Amino acid sequence: HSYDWLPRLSKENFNAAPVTCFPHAPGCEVWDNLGVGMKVEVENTDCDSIEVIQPGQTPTSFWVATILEIKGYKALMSYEGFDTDSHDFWVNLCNAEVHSVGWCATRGKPLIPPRTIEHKYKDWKDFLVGRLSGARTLPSNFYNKINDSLQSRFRLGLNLECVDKDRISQVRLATVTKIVGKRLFLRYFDSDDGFWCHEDSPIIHPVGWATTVGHNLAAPQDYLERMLAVHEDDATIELFKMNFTFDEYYSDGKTNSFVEGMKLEAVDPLNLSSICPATVMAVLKFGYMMIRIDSYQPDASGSDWFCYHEKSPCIFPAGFCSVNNISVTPPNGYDSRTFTWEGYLRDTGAVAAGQHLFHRIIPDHGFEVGMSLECADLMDPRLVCVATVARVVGRLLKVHFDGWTDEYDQWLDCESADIYPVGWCVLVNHKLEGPPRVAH
Amino acid sequence: PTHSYDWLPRLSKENFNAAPVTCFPHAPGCEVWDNLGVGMKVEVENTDCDSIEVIQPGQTPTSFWVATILEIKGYKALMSYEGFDTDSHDFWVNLCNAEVHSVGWCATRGKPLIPPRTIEHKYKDWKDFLVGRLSGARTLPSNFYNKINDSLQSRFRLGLNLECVDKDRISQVRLATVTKIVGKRLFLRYFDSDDGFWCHEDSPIIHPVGWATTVGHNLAAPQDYLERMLAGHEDDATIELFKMNFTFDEYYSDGKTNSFVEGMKLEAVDPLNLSSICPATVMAVLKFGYMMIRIDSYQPDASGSDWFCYHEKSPCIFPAGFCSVNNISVTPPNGYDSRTFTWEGYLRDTGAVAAGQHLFHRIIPDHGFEVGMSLECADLMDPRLVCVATVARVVGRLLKVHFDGWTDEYDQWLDCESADIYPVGWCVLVNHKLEGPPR
Amino acid sequence: HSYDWLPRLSKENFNAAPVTCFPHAPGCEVWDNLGVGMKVEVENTDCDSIEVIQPGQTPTSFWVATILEIKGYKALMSYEGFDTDSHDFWVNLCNAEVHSVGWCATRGKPLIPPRTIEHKYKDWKDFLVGRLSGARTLPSNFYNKINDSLQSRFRLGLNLECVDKDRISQVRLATVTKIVGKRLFLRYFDSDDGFWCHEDSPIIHPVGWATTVGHNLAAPQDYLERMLHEDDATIELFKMNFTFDEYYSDGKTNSFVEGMKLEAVDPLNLSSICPATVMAVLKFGYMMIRIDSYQPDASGSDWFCYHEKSPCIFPAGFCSVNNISVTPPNGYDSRTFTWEGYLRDTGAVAAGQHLFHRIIPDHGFEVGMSLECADLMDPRLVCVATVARVVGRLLKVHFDGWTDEYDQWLDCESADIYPVGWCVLVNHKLEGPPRVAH
């Protein structure tokens, strides 16, 4: 059973990140067409079936309300004509039958007053004209715009290259078998396993990416043969989000920035609650590189190496945690007491990647500590859960799952494709995990 | 100097809700306010360091450090010095009064940034730390405070003559001169007396030279001025200095209107009691949309000395039934009770007709005011005073403003674009005393 | 064959209406991303096949050029590296292989200098850096946006209600059987006959329109019954300059009234504006009018539906005020016609000025501008045309090589006018000016 935000919305000073904090969220680019104080037609939950309904058409009767609050996709509604707040109610803006004023009349539907106030007037004309004249309502194309923004760039059956969750040092060929709110279910070939991934995620890549970049690739024989030697179902480059262009690189993709052996800091791809010193293990083409998290146990196979692009917002120069008051996860063999970067560099005889190799701009993203949102569990991406912004560090967020220990926290970029506004799950028909219930 | 109310204790509480500067179109900085944002970096006064900086004579004696803006409440900003692990030394500033600059301002003037005493031990060279904190971060545009300064200036200057509503006889305007300006609030001294009053430059009760004669409004003025008018100067306040929500192009050359008619009834904010909205009567239709109305709650008075001019497009007049439709307690006409008053009965009693809905043109903007928001508000009955206030009600574009610590009897009905409301911190910005809640 | 604009393009001071003058034209909304002086990668027509081409990829080799002029969709290209303009060439901007600079290198393709200038440099790097550094080029998504703007809202197989060209007082069921540049060929249900019209044309309507509005309808028996399906052309596919929110639920109006007189473009003769009479007020602003110049006919077969907000109806006096020779009512002289006399003769009244709401945009059309225009009387044809007059927002469009008798009155936002080069873009034939025989 999916979690309803209602008990949280009912609390005073409930703090939800607005939809405009999420560039990839449906409705973000038209969200300014909404505002507190605006009037809408909305379901009347307090009336009889006195309206003769055309069969096939909606059996719902409507009245007019004012929006008092907006929290994510949620709106607090107050029916016109009520003297108190006792009947105010929350709706999902893009799921509930909510329309511009005038919508009903165009469809031959009368507005029906809630029973609580129905006898206040005989003819409600003068009241409604008084309340609604010169007032703001929805643009008529609003839900057309919302619908447009719901569509994924991907379709079912597309083949793409995605990081193997069982061996992150390689990508494996996978096909899209299901899409929910632009989250793709990817099914690996040569097995029956797979995982969920948002369409904007950095760990999925077009056909031919691995071969071009020089990344490890696992795939059926026919595909491997094609790679060394375009089909209708190839996911091509234009379907994928990048914070750079390939025009920025030479044709052969040869780079001269990061060098093998350089040290830095990075979010641990296997433990998102951890930022740890890391080492450049291999520099690929077009800015991509394999790094290793230094807190791991020794391993010469390199099965645990992970690819980050040089412009990734999830890599940082050495000292990032220290400068920003974050508890760094010390390298293997070190303590939160014994660890300093200077000492570490001396012990290993290594060089840290210069600050100039990193390029970060800090947008006015609008996220603040304490804001509620919905967040995917990167370790079990079937799940999207109730979450809270625990830290804001420039453009970097630490996200906490309400009701869980801090061990499950996730360091995520402010433009991560895995965070969503309150109400997103209802909008896209995804299940929302609520906080677990405390046993004792 | 005197004791002015400091917002500090309110700012220090959780969930303090101040109307942002952008809610006030006339407020200094409104048009450039979106160049500010939480998370941005600025150079600001270091209050925690010894005078180790060699100050060039004539320049500012202040030493600076960098800080992040954590919160913005009206003109107030919560600063946090870079390099502090906790919030123990966070501090509120007046954004447009304090020595605040874009990062880089000091270096261009040869000034070094000095770390606060409390954290000076953390690094020998703060270069790497500062590069880490500031690279890619937002700061102020270099012209920010120039734009602020420009927005501080009144359209008026001292010595200008204008026609303004006589506070002692509101049915006439009287010639007055501007003798003082504070935050674009003008002190107007009437001629042929020693009396005067404060009002903002955007107020609808002040008018250019020649207005009364052109419109047909009662005028009191020195004989010389009266003589100049009946025929038809460097210190004349002219039309372009005054705010209007209409143009004279919208009216015929002679200003003859055919909308409101003498005898029509309506509702209006009582100019002598802003807590009251009352049935009113059109007593005389002037030219160019202006008209004299009588508040029906007043005692009988055939002189007409208490008639008041509202323009037909004023946001402070409403059709009959406005209060009833919006759940506002209407002030009953003289001789009536709140329970025993209905418009239907009153119109029958007086044999009068109500002005039609089509005569009123009201548009409700997304002004952004919400119930419970704090602001600063002038007392219209004593415009010397600007006081701590709260939005008590939002009714379309109409606000009910409550003075913290006072009874509701002193509330004021004011339009959302009233020139008498200001952001938190405005009094400090313009050097006006702020009246706090009474004892 | 199809007419080529080149002889006009090659003359100095050729004035073509820019693409931005046509709201419905492909590329209109992104056209401001183009500019004279910008650089592009473009087909090299002057080279040997020295470039090794990959299978599946374009066999074309590219060089760089500067855009010197833009006329409609036409652009004058000048290859970098030449000493004279003798090799400058016109291209169709949205048909030719044109790309942002950088496009080839990302695809491993080298730029190949035209043979004419190939020996000027061994390594062309220093020259190209000198010419291209800081220069404007195309946004990378430019032609993606163009391609999106090419698609019609309609598809083959959709059924709709459209004006019967054999009896314009009724609409008749028809099927979209072909689409060329958003111009639809509509084949009538009961015939092999049909007609062309743009998807934005006011004479096509969704399934159910006639029944809802109260317009005469010719249609199959079962269709008529259904009114009183997957191939139904529905409301959202049709362009309107109003919303139904603006009208009462039942579409009852109280603006135009039967008997009122006005002026209107003759639907049967676009060269003509004539006094007209409201014969039947329908619902939602639609009304049947009759052109007063027609021969007497009491059948009502020649009545025509104009919506009340049509830019093709005008208040009485429109022609007189704008120095337009009015086509007189039957039995009247043109030069001496007056509304005062005519209203007296007929005892009728003119529709008031307040019933019309004409706003005049800065459409940018100017007298003498070249464009392409559909022949409204034979909509198979799109022809070379010139703006002969601008009357507020109304255009008088002249067909080059024809007499002024064939001119058409068209609103500035008509879907029947197109930029120079449109026909080539959408693969429609362009009718040139007829040759002068003597």
């Binding site: 006015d364 993203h365 | 937002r138 | 190209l128 080029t137 990378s140």
Partner: peptide
């Protein structure tokens, strides 16, 4: 917020010829 799409942007592009390859800094609107 304030940080959003701009009317024009510089773009680093590359050009390849038979003699080699190099970068060029240009610009485009939208």
């Amino acid at each position: 917020g304030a940080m959003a799409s701009r009317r024009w942007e510089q773009k680093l592009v590359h050009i390849k010829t038979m003699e080699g390859e190099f970068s060029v800094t240009m610009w485009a609107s939208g």
